[PDB]
UniProtKB/TrEMBL annotation, chain B:
UniProt name for this protein: Tropomyosin alpha-4 chain
Boundaries of the shown chain within the full protein: 101 to 149 of 248
Organism field: Sus scrofa (Pig)
Family the UniProt entry places it in: Belongs to the tropomyosin family.
Top-level division of the source organism's lineage: Eukaryota
Coiled-coil regions listed in the entry: none
Compartment(s) of residence: Cytoplasm, Cytoskeleton
Subunit structure, interactors included: Homodimer. Heterodimer of an alpha (TPM1, TPM3 or TPM4) and a beta (TPM2) chain.
Length: 49, 49
């Protein structure tokens, strides 16, 4: 039962690491999207002119 | 040991849902970006034309 224990909390640390890293990889995308969207509006006005 | 491994099992299941729900948002916003820069391509090309 102690073997089963150790397997369980090592899997818990690994899962928490993955969940922590995923949100950072997510939050970079928001500022990247905002910047590229501003550039897209800029190019649209260029073309209309 | 049996009692608190059952506790750790339900904690692991909760962590698994949290990780999956976190990954879904990133995999959706990626598709949003993929549409965005292609729109940027076509607007820029129309501008040179």
């Amino acid at each position: 039962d102690e073997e089963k224990m150790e397997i369980q909390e090592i899997q818990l640390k690994e899962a928490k690491h993955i969940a922590e890293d995923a949100d950072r990889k997510y939050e970079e995308v928001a500022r990247k999207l905002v910047i590229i969207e501003s550039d897209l509006e800029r190019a649209e006005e260029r073309a209309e002119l | 040991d049996e009692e608190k491994m059952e506790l750790q099992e339900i904690q692991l299941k909760e962590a698994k849902h949290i990780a999956e729900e976190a990954d879904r948002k990133y995999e959706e916003v990626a598709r949003k970006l993929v549409i965005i820069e292609g729109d940027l391509e076509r607007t820029e090309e129309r501008a040179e034309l």
